Amino acid sequence: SLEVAQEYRNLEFDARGSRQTIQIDGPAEWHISTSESWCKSSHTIGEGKQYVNITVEANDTQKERTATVTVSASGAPDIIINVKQSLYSVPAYDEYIAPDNTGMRDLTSMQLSALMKAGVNVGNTFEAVIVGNDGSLSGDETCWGNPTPNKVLFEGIKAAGFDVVRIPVAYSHQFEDAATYKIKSAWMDKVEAAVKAALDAGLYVIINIHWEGGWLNHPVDANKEALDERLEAMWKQIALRFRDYDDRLLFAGTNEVNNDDANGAQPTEENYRVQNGFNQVFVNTVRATGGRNHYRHLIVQAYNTDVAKAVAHFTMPLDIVQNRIFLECHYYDPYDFTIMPNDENFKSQWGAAFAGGDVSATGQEGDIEATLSSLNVFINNNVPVIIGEYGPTLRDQLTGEALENHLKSRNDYIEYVVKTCVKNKLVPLYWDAGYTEKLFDRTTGQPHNAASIAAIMKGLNLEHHHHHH
């Protein structure tokens, strides 16, 4: 005697990966199979009265799909359960407007990436926050020592040969209502004015929600509901403000998501699940606004923006349009050369020219090639990759031979990273924080470090002009 309750005969799943426990009331021996690889039973063979899980993979096909689950036993009729899984759909927002392709070229993110080429960050600016010991946030875009981004800065960036600017942004120091995460319109106006100036200068523009005190750095189930709700509430506002901008404006959902409570522990499967979930929340929220945001190119982040973690653990969000998502990683290897503080055991030199000198034990040419080339798995899957930040600090306290060798090392490193990105079809964005590493004078937009700008341009053009077999 083989029995399955009527409630279990016709199962329905949404597009997410998910599971449902059913009950099989069977004899001493029974069996289960399914008709499709995306629909799995926890059990192949069973006995008696058992809780059995039916699990579906995420449906990224943009069509409804169906399967059967067949329960069988010797001398008993088969019981055949229907499984239906829906296509991906966006949350319903009252503010939704119909999709609009005005200014939205018919280009995949991969194709767009090939036009973007290289760029720079306007770092330590709109994301600058004064952080108190209780996590309280204050300040504005000038609080880390930079002036407001202006027209002449963006014009200078474009004139030097850059085609993209990443503008990190903080918002959580500018709430009108903290409980609902309502952002002051006056702050949004300032952000928008900078975006407009950058676009008018002829640049691609990327805006994000950056670190801003680290509130997002709790990728655990205990905090997922609150964090997902906040990330949505914030992105809904930003997406609505910027909805009518053309395809030169891209959104990046998060920055460097980490578990701030785990003290550098290896991340867990829970951490990857919840962090990949943040990327999904961001995509859902933007798409749910409709208009040009239906088509906008969106940028989602690897865990910690780490390359190896991208390769091992990043999952593509489900989306309502095809091929309009980029992956973002950051790249600062070797850390003891690039960004380790001056009061720690830094290495001032880098690369083959300084082998046997004050160089790092890792992150020389071969290591850089290995790590950046590992991103080929994305490129070959038609997923473009932005290296959203790279670059070494400039240790201006050094003197004599040590300073000269350091300055050379920075430029050798910069050129090498850039050329390696180009070879691998990655888009490299230099970390300019307006301090000693800066490329431009923030006030006038004039070049500050012509030699380092030239290193980037040499890296960009190396294999085009000076090519060989």
Side-chain angles (χ1 to χ4, degrees), residues 90-97 231-233 235-237 239-240 243 281-282 284-290:
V90 304
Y93 290 162
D94 291 349
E95 299 86 349
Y96 177 84
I97 67 178
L231 188 63
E232 176 179 23
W235 269 110
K236 184 175 179 185
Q237 293 170 82
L240 287 171
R243 183 164 55 184
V281 173
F282 160 65
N284 290 349
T285 302
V286 174
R287 298 303 187 215
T289 67

Side-chain angles (χ1 to χ4, degrees), residues 230-403:
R230 178 171 178 174
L231 188 63
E232 176 179 23
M234 295 179 74
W235 269 110
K236 184 175 179 185
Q237 293 170 82
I238 300 157
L240 287 171
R241 171 65 76 109
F242 289 101
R243 183 164 55 184
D244 297 339
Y245 288 82
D246 76 19
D247 68 9
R248 294 165 312 151
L249 180 63
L250 296 83
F251 305 157
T254 74
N255 187 44
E256 298 181 354
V257 173
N258 183 239
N259 188 358
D260 277 356
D261 286 357
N263 201 228
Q266 303 303 322
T268 64
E269 288 308 318
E270 171 184 24
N271 300 148
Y272 298 118
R273 177 167 48 72
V274 174
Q275 179 266 327
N276 278 307
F278 296 151
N279 291 337
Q280 188 73 67
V281 173
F282 160 65
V283 170
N284 290 349
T285 302
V286 174
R287 298 303 187 215
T289 67
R292 290 175 184 78
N293 288 342
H294 181 81
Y295 295 108
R296 187 172 312 291
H297 298 257
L298 306 182
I299 304 160
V300 294
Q301 292 64 51
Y303 193 96
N304 278 1
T305 59
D306 179 74
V307 173
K309 292 174 178 66
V311 172
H313 307 286
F314 168 84
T315 63
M316 281 294 281
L318 300 174
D319 199 358
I320 192 67
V321 286
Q322 297 192 69
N323 303 131
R324 294 300 189 280
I325 295 175
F326 286 74
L327 172 67
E328 176 175 13
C329 299
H330 298 169
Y331 189 74
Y332 287 110
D333 298 342
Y335 174 81
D336 63 357
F337 173 71
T338 58
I339 59 168
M340 171 176 280
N342 286 308
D343 71 346
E344 291 177 32
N345 187 38
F346 63 85
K347 302 296 186 187
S348 62
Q349 296 172 358
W350 178 87
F354 298 104
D358 189 43
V359 300
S360 306
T362 64
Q364 308 303 289
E365 290 88 340
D367 282 2
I368 295 174
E369 178 76 281
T371 297
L372 292 177
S373 75
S374 76
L375 293 164
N376 70 356
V377 66
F378 299 106
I379 300 300
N380 288 331
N381 277 324
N382 203 30
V383 177
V385 181
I386 292 161
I387 301 301
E389 304 178 17
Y390 75 98
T393 192
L394 197 163
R395 305 187 191 272
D396 70 331
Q397 82 279 12
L398 301 180
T399 65
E401 193 177 349
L403 176 62

